[PDB]
Amino acid sequence: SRLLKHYGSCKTAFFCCDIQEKFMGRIANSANCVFVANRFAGLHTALGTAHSVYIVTEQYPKGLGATSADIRLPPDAHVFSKKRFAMLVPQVMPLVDLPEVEQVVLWGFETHVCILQTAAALLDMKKKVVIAVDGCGSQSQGDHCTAIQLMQSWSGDGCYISTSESILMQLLKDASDPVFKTIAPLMKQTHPIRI
Amino acid sequence: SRLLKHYGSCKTAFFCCDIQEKFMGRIANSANCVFVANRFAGLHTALGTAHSVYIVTEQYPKGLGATSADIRLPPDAHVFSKKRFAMLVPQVMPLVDLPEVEQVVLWGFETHVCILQTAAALLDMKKKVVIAVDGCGSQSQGDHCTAIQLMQSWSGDGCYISTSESILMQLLKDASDPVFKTIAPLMKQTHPIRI
Amino acid sequence: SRLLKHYGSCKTAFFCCDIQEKFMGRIANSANCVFVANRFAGLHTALGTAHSVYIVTEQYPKGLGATSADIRLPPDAHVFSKKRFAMLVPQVMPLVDLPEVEQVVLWGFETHVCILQTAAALLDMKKKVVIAVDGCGSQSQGDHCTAIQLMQSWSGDGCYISTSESILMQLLKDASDPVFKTIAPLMKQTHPIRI
Amino acid sequence: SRLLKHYGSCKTAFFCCDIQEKFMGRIANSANCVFVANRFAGLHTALGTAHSVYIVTEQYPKGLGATSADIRLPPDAHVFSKKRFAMLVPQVMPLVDLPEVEQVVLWGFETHVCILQTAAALLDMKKKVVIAVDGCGSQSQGDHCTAIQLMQSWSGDGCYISTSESILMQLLKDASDPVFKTIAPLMKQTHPIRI
């Protein structure tokens, strides 16, 4: 499939990469990355545990802080600490290394480090991975842009770049879907910084 | 063929995606999307039913309104209502699921939802699909741009992104073509918003 | 080979597409397209007929005028009239449909019509084709940009987009090449409009 | 592997292309290209000769000057003169034409000439090559941009475009890596010109 499959077709993991306190003042669009984390949290909660898993990593939180308090994590979020840049640490693997978890929606900090390397690692596991660019950021725009462009060249192998609104509507496919009415209000919310 | 074939080689479907009243004030370049709808309407009428079919969808028109009144639909336009985001609903399938209808010119609202998903669905049917970017739009520029870029990565499989003027001249191939004189005035018309 | 081969490896055709009087005031960067035509004219003359052929087309010159008088065509330029948008008309074919003419440097007007369609036609003939983007233009920037982007997606099949200076140095490969001293002054000339 | 392998997996060559005195005042972002040369010099010295080789070329230094004095070359840098545009001259080949030297980090002047042609030559040798775009430049922005875009289309074959910070963290993979503490200060240094 070139786009995400419908949420009932397979299970989807939402990978929230290192959106932590010490990055908030160093990544220009941090506020959108929080917004996207909240949007996918709301989606995940609407889809339910039959269809969605929400995975959060924190890079060295002793030094870099917890996940931003502006994110309202779902109550069943799985949160892990790491020093590896890719999110695919041994505690995460039993959550995604299952044949039913076919596709990962990935976003966070930093685009050219943890996000990039996570996408690559997921491609090595033969998973579909969709970057939500509007929820990604780096400390410099050039680092971010060049990495997005790198990931856009991997479409052939199952990694592509999309936006959170496109991702929501990819998973649903049809306004008559039973969860549409529940999800529709998320798309009426506006990014804090213009996209 | 990497570009559209000449109009006599196969039949071409013009897919006008959801250019409806309630989007007109929410999609910045809506006026160009109407302009492109009118340009392809004029082309379709010049080519005739031997070579062209014009298909319009409206997403939930009870809520989102009819197709914009600024569009002058051809008298033989096939207009359908849908809730599916992709245009390939059961009423549309007998119009395009024919071996002679090899290529679809696709444009409208919104780039990252209905247009994107329609392109993907057409690629699944092994059709050639050409996006007229100058007739596409989203409520946010970021959603639109990222989706265009996604579709530009699918060239290998028969989806590429072009403009209405390029599309017209792709179908004709030569100024001595019998319909050129009829079509040429369409290209002298100017987009309402600068491209 | 991914780039142009060295000029002695095979013969190179310079395709100067329709840089005519009536377009000069309608294509914003027309002055650069003339500049690029002159640069390649100088290169062609330095390489000699052993290694280079210079082919000019004019689209309906009765209506659109001759090739711009600001271009100093080489004395052995082959100039042809056409109504086909692609340059590969029957009079041109005996100049390029030879196994030694492996690669074509292509530029001119308009990017999304004659240039685009010529590239496609050359790809059908299994030739390498390199677009000199700095010598290409359209009446609208959007038409031009979208077509360049389309052609950049065809790299896999032997069409890529480069610039005239890059093209010169691709053909030569080494400053100790016998023609370098002759060609070097062309690269010191400055585009009339900043690139 | 789609990204650079970890530094212990194979040996990495840092190719510093022609960052010479006479270009410094002619390439707008020359100061960043020096900065990137220094960053990779520091990385190379931290990794050691087991894992890294630093190769510098100078194009006709009699005419174009030495490598910029603002670059602090490592004491074991291998520096060579050339007239070939590609860096893969006979003196360089015994440094990289070894099965252990699997990947080259490439940057310098000019993007559309020596850098471009070096990437192509390395691809011919079946090496992985990663362009550090933030350390590349040309005398004109258009020449540089178009060449970067050309190289971004070669990802399928083992050439991609990244940034120096992304490259550093690709080679390391994990903050608990023994050299991280040594390398981390390099990433806290700021480019002289905003990226």
**Residues in β-strands, percent of chain A:** 15-25%
CATH superfamily of chain A, by name, is Isochorismatase-like
> Number of helix segments of chain A?
7
N→C terminal distance of chain A: 27 Å
What is the overall silhouette of chain A?
Answer: globular
Protein chain pair with the most extensive contact, residues per chain:
A-B, 24 and 24 residues
Question: Based on the structure, what is the oligomeric state of the protein chains?
Answer: homotetramer
What's the story with the biggest beta sheet of chain A?
A: 6 strands, parallel
Order of helices and strands of chain A: EHEHEHEHEHEHH
CATH architecture of chain A, by name, is 3-Layer(aba) Sandwich
Strand count of chain A: 6
Based on secondary structure, the structural category of chain A is alpha/beta
Helix coverage percent of chain A: 25-40%
Protein name (chains A, B, C, D): Ribonuclease mar1, putative
Family (chains A, B, C, D): Belongs to the isochorismatase family.
Pfam families (chains A, B, C, D): Isochorismatase (PF00857)
Domain Isochorismatase-like (chains A, B, C, D): 12-164
